[PDB]
């Protein structure tokens, strides 16, 4: 509702997160193999629908 | 309360805490009234998180005034009840960020 100097949204905030962690631990307690998952999720969240 | 929590009022807490109870510019017993005046909406608050003290580290204060005012044992046990408390916050998995 508020977005920054120079930018559309909040999306650019995703860049800081360490997805390996996240995916080590969602390997640890739910065995489920998503590392490629959550880039393909940052990069959907950046901008919706790209022409691929 | 949320509000006051962003506006990170455990921070501002802290110094009012230290001015009146390790400085002393005031009377023991008026002090304590005063302490126990304090301790009551710490311990009321919603907390969810240890992140929010992390911001103002007031168990530390808590702990030296605890410490100074050891003879008042109401204080110390408000104090040990307001700590057992929030050591039981965490955060569950909380993802790390890049530095």
């Known amino acids: ?52 | 309360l949320k509000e006051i929590v962003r506006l990170r009022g455990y921070q501002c807490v802290a110094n009012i805490l230290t001015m009146i109870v390790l400085d002393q510019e005031q009377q023991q017993v008026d002090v304590e009234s005063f302490t126990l005046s304090v301790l009551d909406m710490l311990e009321s608050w919603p907390n969810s998180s240890r992140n929010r003290i992390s911001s103002s580290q007031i168990e530390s204060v808590l702990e030296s005034v605890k410490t100074k005012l050891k003879k008042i044992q109401p204080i110390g046990k408000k104090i040990n009840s307001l700590l057992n408390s929030w050591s039981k916050l965490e955060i569950s998995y909380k993802i790390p960020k890049s530095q």
């Open chain 1, 1 to 52: 509702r508020s977005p920054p100097k120079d930018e559309d949204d909040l999306t650019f905030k995703l860049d800081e997160l360490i997805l390996d962690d996240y995916a080590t631990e969602l390997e640890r307690k739910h065995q489920l193999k998503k590392r490629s998952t959550l880039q393909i999720i940052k990069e959907e969240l950046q901008s919706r629908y790209r022409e691929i």
